[PDB]
Amino acid sequence: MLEYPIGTPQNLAGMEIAAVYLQPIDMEPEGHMRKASESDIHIEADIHALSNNPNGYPEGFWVPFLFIKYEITKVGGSGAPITGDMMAMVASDGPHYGDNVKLQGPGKYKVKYTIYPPNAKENPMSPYYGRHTDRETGVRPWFKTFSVEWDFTYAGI
Amino acid sequence: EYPIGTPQNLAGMEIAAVYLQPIDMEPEGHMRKASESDIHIEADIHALSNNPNGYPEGFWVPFLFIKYEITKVGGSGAPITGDMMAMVASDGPHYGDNVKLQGPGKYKVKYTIYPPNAKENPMSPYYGRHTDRETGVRPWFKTFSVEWDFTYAGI
Ligand SMILES: [Cu+2]
Ligand SMILES: [Cu+2]
Ligand SMILES: [Mg+2]
Ligand SMILES: [Mg+2]
Ligand SMILES: [Mg+2]
């Protein structure tokens, strides 16, 4: 699949956190994404386990049941961020966290993701995902909510 | 880990059934307590090559909902029923449940696998699927069931 990377990936808590963007998409169920015709991009968080991930994920596996909030700010604009929540979904290249976003024209932007673990109060998927805690098959506790930032230049795609 | 027959290949996925000792899980109060169970039953679901829903080969298939039915051969005739829950363990993510069985002997195991958009799937409002030409994938598989036979001896 064809995508545009936003900066360089960041490694935190045995996970690789990468930011990418593409053209606005169409998704099932309908009515969750902002219509493709009213958006500029599909913003995406690519989260995969690294070697020796402490939550039992083999290397390169998708990290599931996370909750991602984003804030996008145009450099030299109003000063008010474009905010939203991502949603977990699958595309031709595999599962990810994404959202159709309307930007504020060509320019430099700051992108911030707030990544919530599966047990966070803010994560709506918390009652649906568990973690083994016994000695023989258990894993380490979940990481705590954290934020990651990148810069990028948007020209129009 | 103890196997429940042979894995079955359906709708671009490998579906395998296994069991091991009852486990402990966070959040507490979802699993039947390890001390009140005989086994932890699992559904191991991974994508095959050319999976029609965009999953690369060997990837875990997420946001599924699995219902199981376990009936002891020669017993009452009434199945032990339940819902599995998605979780992670040292060997990776899977769908599992702590289960109390009815003694050693032969059992029939049936899993009903619900796609992410099924009415019965409680995770349906939280998982999407791209449908556009450039990044889209094929529609979800329809709900299906898989069965195996196994002999239970214990621990
Ligand atoms: Cu997406
Ligand atoms: Cu389990
Ligand atoms: Mg991608
Ligand atoms: Mg214990
Ligand atoms: Mg296993």
PDB file of N, CA and C in Angstrom, chain A residues 72-145:
ATOM      1  N   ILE A  72      -3.413  18.287  15.795  1.00  0.00           N
ATOM      2  CA  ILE A  72      -2.628  18.683  14.653  1.00  0.00           C
ATOM      3  C   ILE A  72      -2.640  20.177  14.604  1.00  0.00           C
ATOM      4  N   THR A  73      -1.455  20.787  14.564  1.00  0.00           N
ATOM      5  CA  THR A  73      -1.396  22.237  14.618  1.00  0.00           C
ATOM      6  C   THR A  73      -0.610  22.790  13.478  1.00  0.00           C
ATOM      7  N   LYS A  74      -1.199  23.742  12.766  1.00  0.00           N
ATOM      8  CA  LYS A  74      -0.478  24.370  11.674  1.00  0.00           C
ATOM      9  C   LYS A  74       0.501  25.357  12.247  1.00  0.00           C
ATOM     10  N   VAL A  75       1.737  25.283  11.777  1.00  0.00           N
ATOM     11  CA  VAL A  75       2.792  26.230  12.131  1.00  0.00           C
ATOM     12  C   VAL A  75       2.429  27.565  11.441  1.00  0.00           C
ATOM     13  N   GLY A  76       2.343  28.623  12.235  1.00  0.00           N
ATOM     14  CA  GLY A  76       2.010  29.963  11.773  1.00  0.00           C
ATOM     15  C   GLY A  76       0.531  30.219  11.522  1.00  0.00           C
ATOM     16  N   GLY A  77      -0.334  29.255  11.869  1.00  0.00           N
ATOM     17  CA  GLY A  77      -1.777  29.408  11.712  1.00  0.00           C
ATOM     18  C   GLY A  77      -2.449  30.088  12.896  1.00  0.00           C
ATOM     19  N   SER A  78      -3.718  29.739  13.165  1.00  0.00           N
ATOM     20  CA  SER A  78      -4.548  30.269  14.261  1.00  0.00           C
ATOM     21  C   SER A  78      -3.977  29.989  15.678  1.00  0.00           C
ATOM     22  N   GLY A  79      -3.345  28.829  15.857  1.00  0.00           N
ATOM     23  CA  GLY A  79      -2.798  28.375  17.132  1.00  0.00           C
ATOM     24  C   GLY A  79      -3.649  27.280  17.752  1.00  0.00           C
ATOM     25  N   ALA A  80      -4.895  27.104  17.225  1.00  0.00           N
ATOM     26  CA  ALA A  80      -5.895  26.120  17.677  1.00  0.00           C
ATOM     27  C   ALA A  80      -5.726  24.790  16.953  1.00  0.00           C
ATOM     28  N   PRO A  81      -5.499  23.696  17.693  1.00  0.00           N
ATOM     29  CA  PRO A  81      -5.293  22.401  17.026  1.00  0.00           C
ATOM     30  C   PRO A  81      -6.555  21.780  16.440  1.00  0.00           C
ATOM     31  N   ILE A  82      -6.354  20.900  15.452  1.00  0.00           N
ATOM     32  CA  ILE A  82      -7.370  20.063  14.847  1.00  0.00           C
ATOM     33  C   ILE A  82      -7.269  18.796  15.712  1.00  0.00           C
ATOM     34  N   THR A  83      -8.340  18.458  16.416  1.00  0.00           N
ATOM     35  CA  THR A  83      -8.320  17.320  17.317  1.00  0.00           C
ATOM     36  C   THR A  83      -9.283  16.247  16.859  1.00  0.00           C
ATOM     37  N   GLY A  84      -9.053  15.040  17.359  1.00  0.00           N
ATOM     38  CA  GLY A  84      -9.901  13.908  17.059  1.00  0.00           C
ATOM     39  C   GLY A  84      -9.403  12.637  17.690  1.00  0.00           C
ATOM     40  N   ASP A  85     -10.173  11.574  17.477  1.00  0.00           N
ATOM     41  CA  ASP A  85      -9.848  10.231  17.955  1.00  0.00           C
ATOM     42  C   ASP A  85      -9.674   9.373  16.772  1.00  0.00           C
ATOM     43  N   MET A  86      -8.715   8.482  16.853  1.00  0.00           N
ATOM     44  CA  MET A  86      -8.510   7.531  15.781  1.00  0.00           C
ATOM     45  C   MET A  86      -9.403   6.355  16.062  1.00  0.00           C
ATOM     46  N   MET A  87      -9.539   5.463  15.087  1.00  0.00           N
ATOM     47  CA  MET A  87     -10.317   4.260  15.234  1.00  0.00           C
ATOM     48  C   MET A  87      -9.453   3.124  14.683  1.00  0.00           C
ATOM     49  N   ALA A  88      -9.513   1.922  15.315  1.00  0.00           N
ATOM     50  CA  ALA A  88      -8.817   0.723  14.853  1.00  0.00           C
ATOM     51  C   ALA A  88      -9.588   0.250  13.620  1.00  0.00           C
ATOM     52  N   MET A  89      -8.860  -0.213  12.592  1.00  0.00           N
ATOM     53  CA  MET A  89      -9.425  -0.641  11.320  1.00  0.00           C
ATOM     54  C   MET A  89      -8.430  -1.449  10.544  1.00  0.00           C
ATOM     55  N   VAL A  90      -8.878  -2.071   9.458  1.00  0.00           N
ATOM     56  CA  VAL A  90      -8.014  -2.845   8.584  1.00  0.00           C
ATOM     57  C   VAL A  90      -8.130  -2.313   7.162  1.00  0.00           C
ATOM     58  N   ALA A  91      -6.994  -2.307   6.465  1.00  0.00           N
ATOM     59  CA  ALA A  91      -6.803  -1.868   5.095  1.00  0.00           C
ATOM     60  C   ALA A  91      -5.946  -2.943   4.407  1.00  0.00           C
ATOM     61  N   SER A  92      -5.660  -2.767   3.105  1.00  0.00           N
ATOM     62  CA  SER A  92      -4.918  -3.735   2.275  1.00  0.00           C
ATOM     63  C   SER A  92      -3.540  -4.122   2.850  1.00  0.00           C
ATOM     64  N   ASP A  93      -2.897  -3.223   3.619  1.00  0.00           N
ATOM     65  CA  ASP A  93      -1.587  -3.450   4.239  1.00  0.00           C
ATOM     66  C   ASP A  93      -1.683  -3.985   5.687  1.00  0.00           C
ATOM     67  N   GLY A  94      -2.901  -4.161   6.185  1.00  0.00           N
ATOM     68  CA  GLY A  94      -3.116  -4.663   7.534  1.00  0.00           C
ATOM     69  C   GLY A  94      -3.814  -3.696   8.475  1.00  0.00           C
ATOM     70  N   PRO A  95      -3.956  -4.113   9.749  1.00  0.00           N
ATOM     71  CA  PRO A  95      -4.636  -3.251  10.723  1.00  0.00           C
ATOM     72  C   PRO A  95      -3.778  -2.079  11.180  1.00  0.00           C
ATOM     73  N   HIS A  96      -4.461  -0.990  11.551  1.00  0.00           N
ATOM     74  CA  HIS A  96      -3.858   0.235  12.028  1.00  0.00           C
ATOM     75  C   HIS A  96      -4.928   1.061  12.776  1.00  0.00           C
ATOM     76  N   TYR A  97      -4.556   2.259  13.229  1.00  0.00           N
ATOM     77  CA  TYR A  97      -5.404   3.252  13.884  1.00  0.00           C
ATOM     78  C   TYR A  97      -5.392   4.448  12.921  1.00  0.00           C
ATOM     79  N   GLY A  98      -6.571   4.895  12.507  1.00  0.00           N
ATOM     80  CA  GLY A  98      -6.658   5.995  11.557  1.00  0.00           C
ATOM     81  C   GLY A  98      -7.878   6.872  11.720  1.00  0.00           C
ATOM     82  N   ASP A  99      -7.890   7.990  10.975  1.00  0.00           N
ATOM     83  CA  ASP A  99      -8.991   8.950  10.918  1.00  0.00           C
ATOM     84  C   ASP A  99      -8.898   9.840   9.684  1.00  0.00           C
ATOM     85  N   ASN A 100     -10.066  10.197   9.066  1.00  0.00           N
ATOM     86  CA  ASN A 100     -10.086  11.144   7.946  1.00  0.00           C
ATOM     87  C   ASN A 100     -10.078  12.512   8.573  1.00  0.00           C
ATOM     88  N   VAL A 101      -9.127  13.335   8.145  1.00  0.00           N
ATOM     89  CA  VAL A 101      -8.891  14.643   8.734  1.00  0.00           C
ATOM     90  C   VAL A 101      -8.946  15.728   7.676  1.00  0.00           C
ATOM     91  N   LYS A 102      -9.609  16.840   8.017  1.00  0.00           N
ATOM     92  CA  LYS A 102      -9.614  18.043   7.201  1.00  0.00           C
ATOM     93  C   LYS A 102      -8.497  18.971   7.807  1.00  0.00           C
ATOM     94  N   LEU A 103      -7.502  19.350   6.993  1.00  0.00           N
ATOM     95  CA  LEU A 103      -6.396  20.227   7.387  1.00  0.00           C
ATOM     96  C   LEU A 103      -6.724  21.678   7.081  1.00  0.00           C
ATOM     97  N   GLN A 104      -5.760  22.605   7.257  1.00  0.00           N
ATOM     98  CA  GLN A 104      -5.975  24.039   7.017  1.00  0.00           C
ATOM     99  C   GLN A 104      -5.035  24.591   5.957  1.00  0.00           C
ATOM    100  N   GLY A 105      -4.972  23.902   4.823  1.00  0.00           N
ATOM    101  CA  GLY A 105      -4.136  24.282   3.692  1.00  0.00           C
ATOM    102  C   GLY A 105      -2.698  23.769   3.707  1.00  0.00           C
ATOM    103  N   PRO A 106      -1.944  24.038   2.618  1.00  0.00           N
ATOM    104  CA  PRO A 106      -0.537  23.622   2.590  1.00  0.00           C
ATOM    105  C   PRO A 106       0.317  24.374   3.613  1.00  0.00           C
ATOM    106  N   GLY A 107       1.275  23.660   4.203  1.00  0.00           N
ATOM    107  CA  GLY A 107       2.172  24.229   5.193  1.00  0.00           C
ATOM    108  C   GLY A 107       2.778  23.202   6.112  1.00  0.00           C
ATOM    109  N   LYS A 108       3.514  23.676   7.102  1.00  0.00           N
ATOM    110  CA  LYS A 108       4.133  22.821   8.095  1.00  0.00           C
ATOM    111  C   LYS A 108       3.164  22.623   9.263  1.00  0.00           C
ATOM    112  N   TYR A 109       3.053  21.381   9.714  1.00  0.00           N
ATOM    113  CA  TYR A 109       2.178  20.998  10.813  1.00  0.00           C
ATOM    114  C   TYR A 109       2.930  20.252  11.881  1.00  0.00           C
ATOM    115  N   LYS A 110       2.428  20.336  13.116  1.00  0.00           N
ATOM    116  CA  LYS A 110       2.910  19.547  14.248  1.00  0.00           C
ATOM    117  C   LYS A 110       1.822  18.494  14.504  1.00  0.00           C
ATOM    118  N   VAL A 111       2.218  17.232  14.683  1.00  0.00           N
ATOM    119  CA  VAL A 111       1.298  16.121  14.943  1.00  0.00           C
ATOM    120  C   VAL A 111       1.628  15.513  16.275  1.00  0.00           C
ATOM    121  N   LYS A 112       0.630  15.393  17.153  1.00  0.00           N
ATOM    122  CA  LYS A 112       0.834  14.779  18.465  1.00  0.00           C
ATOM    123  C   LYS A 112      -0.150  13.644  18.668  1.00  0.00           C
ATOM    124  N   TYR A 113       0.319  12.479  19.095  1.00  0.00           N
ATOM    125  CA  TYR A 113      -0.572  11.340  19.391  1.00  0.00           C
ATOM    126  C   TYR A 113      -0.478  11.082  20.855  1.00  0.00           C
ATOM    127  N   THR A 114      -1.634  10.809  21.501  1.00  0.00           N
ATOM    128  CA  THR A 114      -1.716  10.407  22.884  1.00  0.00           C
ATOM    129  C   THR A 114      -2.183   8.954  22.800  1.00  0.00           C
ATOM    130  N   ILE A 115      -1.332   8.040  23.229  1.00  0.00           N
ATOM    131  CA  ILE A 115      -1.568   6.609  23.119  1.00  0.00           C
ATOM    132  C   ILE A 115      -1.975   6.019  24.462  1.00  0.00           C
ATOM    133  N   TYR A 116      -3.212   5.502  24.542  1.00  0.00           N
ATOM    134  CA  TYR A 116      -3.817   4.929  25.742  1.00  0.00           C
ATOM    135  C   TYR A 116      -3.721   3.415  25.717  1.00  0.00           C
ATOM    136  N   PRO A 117      -3.276   2.813  26.835  1.00  0.00           N
ATOM    137  CA  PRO A 117      -3.165   1.347  26.894  1.00  0.00           C
ATOM    138  C   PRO A 117      -4.541   0.664  26.934  1.00  0.00           C
ATOM    139  N   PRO A 118      -4.609  -0.686  26.813  1.00  0.00           N
ATOM    140  CA  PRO A 118      -5.922  -1.358  26.863  1.00  0.00           C
ATOM    141  C   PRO A 118      -6.717  -1.221  28.168  1.00  0.00           C
ATOM    142  N   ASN A 119      -6.075  -0.950  29.310  1.00  0.00           N
ATOM    143  CA  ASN A 119      -6.750  -0.827  30.594  1.00  0.00           C
ATOM    144  C   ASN A 119      -7.051   0.618  31.021  1.00  0.00           C
ATOM    145  N   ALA A 120      -6.726   1.618  30.171  1.00  0.00           N
ATOM    146  CA  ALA A 120      -6.969   3.027  30.489  1.00  0.00           C
ATOM    147  C   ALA A 120      -8.465   3.303  30.586  1.00  0.00           C
ATOM    148  N   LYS A 121      -8.847   4.205  31.497  1.00  0.00           N
ATOM    149  CA  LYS A 121     -10.233   4.630  31.728  1.00  0.00           C
ATOM    150  C   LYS A 121     -10.840   5.217  30.440  1.00  0.00           C
ATOM    151  N   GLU A 122     -10.030   5.974  29.678  1.00  0.00           N
ATOM    152  CA  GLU A 122     -10.435   6.636  28.437  1.00  0.00           C
ATOM    153  C   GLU A 122     -10.578   5.650  27.274  1.00  0.00           C
ATOM    154  N   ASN A 123     -10.016   4.425  27.398  1.00  0.00           N
ATOM    155  CA  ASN A 123     -10.072   3.439  26.320  1.00  0.00           C
ATOM    156  C   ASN A 123     -11.432   2.709  26.326  1.00  0.00           C
ATOM    157  N   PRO A 124     -12.296   2.911  25.307  1.00  0.00           N
ATOM    158  CA  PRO A 124     -13.613   2.230  25.313  1.00  0.00           C
ATOM    159  C   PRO A 124     -13.566   0.711  25.134  1.00  0.00           C
ATOM    160  N   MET A 125     -12.402   0.168  24.725  1.00  0.00           N
ATOM    161  CA  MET A 125     -12.197  -1.263  24.529  1.00  0.00           C
ATOM    162  C   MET A 125     -11.673  -1.993  25.769  1.00  0.00           C
ATOM    163  N   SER A 126     -11.449  -1.257  26.892  1.00  0.00           N
ATOM    164  CA  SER A 126     -10.958  -1.816  28.167  1.00  0.00           C
ATOM    165  C   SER A 126     -11.743  -3.043  28.687  1.00  0.00           C
ATOM    166  N   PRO A 127     -13.101  -3.122  28.578  1.00  0.00           N
ATOM    167  CA  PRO A 127     -13.784  -4.325  29.077  1.00  0.00           C
ATOM    168  C   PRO A 127     -13.638  -5.542  28.161  1.00  0.00           C
ATOM    169  N   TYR A 128     -12.934  -5.403  27.025  1.00  0.00           N
ATOM    170  CA  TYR A 128     -12.870  -6.472  26.027  1.00  0.00           C
ATOM    171  C   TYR A 128     -11.495  -7.091  25.770  1.00  0.00           C
ATOM    172  N   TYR A 129     -10.481  -6.668  26.518  1.00  0.00           N
ATOM    173  CA  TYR A 129      -9.133  -7.179  26.320  1.00  0.00           C
ATOM    174  C   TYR A 129      -8.481  -7.440  27.637  1.00  0.00           C
ATOM    175  N   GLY A 130      -7.922  -8.629  27.750  1.00  0.00           N
ATOM    176  CA  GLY A 130      -7.253  -9.080  28.952  1.00  0.00           C
ATOM    177  C   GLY A 130      -5.760  -9.256  28.787  1.00  0.00           C
ATOM    178  N   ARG A 131      -5.139  -9.669  29.867  1.00  0.00           N
ATOM    179  CA  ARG A 131      -3.716  -9.876  29.966  1.00  0.00           C
ATOM    180  C   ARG A 131      -3.490 -10.994  31.002  1.00  0.00           C
ATOM    181  N   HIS A 132      -2.775 -12.089  30.637  1.00  0.00           N
ATOM    182  CA  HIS A 132      -2.411 -13.133  31.620  1.00  0.00           C
ATOM    183  C   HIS A 132      -1.427 -12.545  32.612  1.00  0.00           C
ATOM    184  N   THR A 133      -1.580 -12.915  33.888  1.00  0.00           N
ATOM    185  CA  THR A 133      -0.749 -12.437  34.998  1.00  0.00           C
ATOM    186  C   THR A 133      -0.056 -13.580  35.757  1.00  0.00           C
ATOM    187  N   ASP A 134      -0.393 -14.850  35.477  1.00  0.00           N
ATOM    188  CA  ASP A 134       0.245 -16.004  36.161  1.00  0.00           C
ATOM    189  C   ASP A 134       1.739 -16.141  35.766  1.00  0.00           C
ATOM    190  N   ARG A 135       2.557 -16.839  36.560  1.00  0.00           N
ATOM    191  CA  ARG A 135       3.987 -16.977  36.297  1.00  0.00           C
ATOM    192  C   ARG A 135       4.325 -17.646  34.950  1.00  0.00           C
ATOM    193  N   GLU A 136       3.682 -18.778  34.647  1.00  0.00           N
ATOM    194  CA  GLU A 136       3.970 -19.577  33.458  1.00  0.00           C
ATOM    195  C   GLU A 136       3.609 -18.936  32.119  1.00  0.00           C
ATOM    196  N   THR A 137       2.513 -18.154  32.046  1.00  0.00           N
ATOM    197  CA  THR A 137       2.044 -17.580  30.766  1.00  0.00           C
ATOM    198  C   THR A 137       1.823 -16.077  30.811  1.00  0.00           C
ATOM    199  N   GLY A 138       2.058 -15.478  31.976  1.00  0.00           N
ATOM    200  CA  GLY A 138       1.839 -14.054  32.172  1.00  0.00           C
ATOM    201  C   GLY A 138       2.830 -13.155  31.477  1.00  0.00           C
ATOM    202  N   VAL A 139       2.464 -11.883  31.404  1.00  0.00           N
ATOM    203  CA  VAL A 139       3.264 -10.803  30.811  1.00  0.00           C
ATOM    204  C   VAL A 139       3.343  -9.623  31.760  1.00  0.00           C
ATOM    205  N   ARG A 140       4.175  -8.644  31.419  1.00  0.00           N
ATOM    206  CA  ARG A 140       4.352  -7.460  32.243  1.00  0.00           C
ATOM    207  C   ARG A 140       3.115  -6.548  32.202  1.00  0.00           C
ATOM    208  N   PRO A 141       2.907  -5.695  33.234  1.00  0.00           N
ATOM    209  CA  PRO A 141       1.783  -4.746  33.193  1.00  0.00           C
ATOM    210  C   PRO A 141       1.825  -3.855  31.955  1.00  0.00           C
ATOM    211  N   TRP A 142       0.669  -3.320  31.587  1.00  0.00           N
ATOM    212  CA  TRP A 142       0.569  -2.393  30.445  1.00  0.00           C
ATOM    213  C   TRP A 142       1.384  -1.125  30.699  1.00  0.00           C
ATOM    214  N   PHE A 143       1.867  -0.484  29.647  1.00  0.00           N
ATOM    215  CA  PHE A 143       2.544   0.823  29.767  1.00  0.00           C
ATOM    216  C   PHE A 143       1.480   1.863  30.234  1.00  0.00           C
ATOM    217  N   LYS A 144       1.926   3.052  30.637  1.00  0.00           N
ATOM    218  CA  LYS A 144       1.044   4.148  31.006  1.00  0.00           C
ATOM    219  C   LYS A 144       0.842   5.052  29.799  1.00  0.00           C
ATOM    220  N   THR A 145      -0.316   5.752  29.745  1.00  0.00           N
ATOM    221  CA  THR A 145      -0.660   6.689  28.676  1.00  0.00           C
ATOM    222  C   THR A 145       0.515   7.639  28.398  1.00  0.00           C
TER     223      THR A 145
END
